[PDB]
Amino acid sequence: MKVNISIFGFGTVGRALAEIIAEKSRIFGVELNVISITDRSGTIWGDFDLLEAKEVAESTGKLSNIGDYEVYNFSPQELVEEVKPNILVDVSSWDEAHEMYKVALGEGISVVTSNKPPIANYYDELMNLAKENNAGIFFESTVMAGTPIIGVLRENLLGENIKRIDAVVNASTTFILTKMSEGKTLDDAIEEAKSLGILEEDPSKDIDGIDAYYKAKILHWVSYGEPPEEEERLGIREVRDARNVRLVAQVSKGKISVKPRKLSSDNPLLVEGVQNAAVIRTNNLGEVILKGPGGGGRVTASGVFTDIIKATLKFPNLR
Amino acid sequence: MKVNISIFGFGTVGRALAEIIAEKSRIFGVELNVISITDRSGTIWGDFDLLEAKEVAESTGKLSNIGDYEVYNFSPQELVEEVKPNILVDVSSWDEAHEMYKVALGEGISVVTSNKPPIANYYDELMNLAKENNAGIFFESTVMAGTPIIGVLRENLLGENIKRIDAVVNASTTFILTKMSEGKTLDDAIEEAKSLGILEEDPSKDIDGIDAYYKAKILHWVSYGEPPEEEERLGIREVRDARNVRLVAQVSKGKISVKPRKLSSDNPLLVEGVQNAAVIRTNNLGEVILKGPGGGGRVTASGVFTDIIKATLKFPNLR
Ligand SMILES: NC(=O)C1=CN([C@@H]2O[C@H](COP(=O)(O)OP(=O)(O)OC[C@H]3O[C@@H](n4cnc5c(N)ncnc54)[C@H](OP(=O)(O)O)[C@@H]3O)[C@@H](O)[C@H]2O)C=CC1
Ligand SMILES: NC(=O)C1=CN([C@@H]2O[C@H](COP(=O)(O)OP(=O)(O)OC[C@H]3O[C@@H](n4cnc5c(N)ncnc54)[C@H](OP(=O)(O)O)[C@@H]3O)[C@@H](O)[C@H]2O)C=CC1
Ligand SMILES: N[C@@H](CCO)C(=O)O
Ligand SMILES: N[C@@H](CCO)C(=O)O
Ligand code: NA
Ligand code: NA
């Protein structure tokens, strides 16, 4: 069977995804065909070579330069309405992308994304809409990227009661905390990280706990099927003694709390360097621990590719 | 969506499964209906209360002792043919149950199991049969029990090439090796383990690496879709220095090797207690680490329940 895929967004994650798809376009009795790609500059739509498009975007930073394919100025809504892919893959930084998803799901087009806010903020509407149009929504790389914590929660532990999830999901903050442990001030450590590309020049999504908050919210959705009643979002700006501290996202029924935690040397949450980690507590299993990378092009595109296959094959969305 | 389930075997695992099915009989749009339970004493079949049957077997030791249901003495083939369930659940210690699986699958009856040898030895025949009869096969609790290593490998990482897997999958051997580490002889360590509940009167399959080898073989099937060419099995009996040693299953394309390995102090495979672990190495993610309990009744039944749901909902088997 053949499936048509519109990729929406084409930055680090989207370009890595094109590689993965190109290397594995025929797999699991499926053929993956990318019929469109979109960035801010525009949309290409037709018979283009996927790695060729990646190359030209890699050098030039836009889809315009492609030889002999020509650009279309579609709105998100037009792109879906006109291209009519079977699968819409959002790998963009467009926070307000839920409106585009609504349209796609209306036409029974499944959505795959790595873009958090639409899932964190509109999870319920999007799920209902999906079920109503014999379609699916997939978001694995919205949490710990390619490391399959969403698979584990969504499609497994199906007889468990999840009492708690704790997770360290920002490598940058483990870096900052480690430097502080070694005697640097927070502000120095931040300066080091920004100059290293570990942090952005606006570091708030890491330092103020916002990325983790969105990830806690998504986890809360999957595990409990409703928005939380209680929210506590904090970052690391108040940390003084940073020994054995990590920025931890904790999820329990009706509660999300992102904040710094001092951890025993024993704790698998006490991750080193760039490693992310999640400890899931259940009634029958005690702790299940999952660790892996939390970012990177190929790492993130890995999750999305898993989701493309599931969408194509219409895997049930149970949670 | 109502589903009819035959449970084959009723020991620690099957009795704990009963508990779980009773508390969660309606979930995810499914009504789970248990129509037959079978042990060596024979087979009950009908309108019987699930927890009651658990209760009589609990105390008495057999199934025959129930009220208002004649026990039938059915062979495995007769059980499938006469009961006609939608899903056959094997939680027995019968090494040769694959022949029964072949029957069910032939009738489009899906199979869920925690029983290792049939999957280790007949996985391809079983997958081909299931495919030809619009049926599935699920075996999560054959490796690390409820700890969902199978879900992770089988239904996720779908864009990955699995470079390797290292795993410690026998809590019993951890205990033994730890005790040898502290000065105890093999035999004294074994006797302590028995007294603790940690080993059976025949520990041989765990001690000699046959269990792990079965497990390694299952992981190899999931990851590469064929048997290995190189096979090495070595148990713990003859370890002279057990310091920081575990019984590690190593899996790579074409290759399985179970043997005691000395590990660094920070190695995640350096597990304690009941805990099992798998370190999965893939081309895009590097290391994914999954840990959790490896045995126990409710732990093992958790994985089987997950599989029951997926069989009922016709989850794809991509690997
Ligand atoms: N990098 C990582 O490790 C991870 C990233 N993610 C998430 O995946 C998404 C992509 O990440 P990443 O690839 O690093 O980000 P990049 O900034 O590298 O790429 C973002 C892409 O989206 C495009 N875009 C942004 N807004 C719009 C819009 N309104 N319409 C059309 N296109 C738009 C960008 O266009 P332009 O360049 O033209 O502005 C660019 O092509 C993000 O939401 C991120 O949070 C998730 C997990 C890991
Ligand atoms: N417990 C654990 O931690 C784990 C177990 N498993 C596996 O799950 C399975 C169940 O283990 P568990 O419940 O602990 O073991 P038990 O020995 O407690 O139960 C085994 C069951 O199988 C029955 N049985 C064996 N052979 C036959 C047969 N030919 N016909 C009918 N019934 C039969 C037994 O009957 P009788 O008592 O009458 O002999 C018993 O009810 C095993 O294959 C085991 O390897 C896998 C992972 C973890
Ligand atoms: N490595 C990222 C996670 C990407 O979703 C961060 O914590 O900011
Ligand atoms: N962890 C268990 C494995 C049972 O499948 C043991 O020690 O045998
Ligand atoms: Na993920
Ligand atoms: Na398992």
Author numbering:
A (entry chain B), B (entry chain A): 1 to 319
Any passages from the paper?
To reduce the number of these interactions, we constructed R40A and K57A mutants, which had striking effects on the enzymes reactivity against NADP. The model of the Hse-bound K57A mutant was refined at a resolution of 2.43 Å. The model of the dimer contained the ordered residues (1–319) in each subunit, two NADPH molecules, two Hse molecules, two Na atoms and 211 water molecules. Moreover, we also observed an extra density within the active site cavity, and after construction and refinement of the peptide chain, a Hse molecule could be modeled into that density. Within our model, the carboxyl group of Hse hydrogen bonded with the side-chain of Asp206 and the backbone N atoms of Ala171 and Ser172 and, via a water molecule (W5), with the backbone O atom of Ile198. The O atom of the C4 hydroxyl group interacts with the side-chains of Lys116 and Lys215 and, via another water molecule (W6), with the backbone N atoms of Met144 and Ala145 and the backbone O atom of Gly294. The C4 atom of Hse is situated in front of the C4 atom of the nicotinamide ring, which enables hydride transfer between the two. Superposition of the Hse/NADPH-bound K57A structure onto the NADPH-bound wild-type structure showed that the NADPH molecule in the mutant structure was positioned/configured nearly identically to the NADPH molecule in the wild-type structure, except for the positioning of the C2 phosphate group of the adenine ribose. In K57A mutant, however, the C2 phosphate group is rotated in a clockwise direction around C2B of NADPH by about 30° relative to the wild-type structure. In addition, the guanidino group of Arg40 in the mutant is also rotated clockwise by about 90° around the NE atom of Arg40 relative to the wild-type structure.
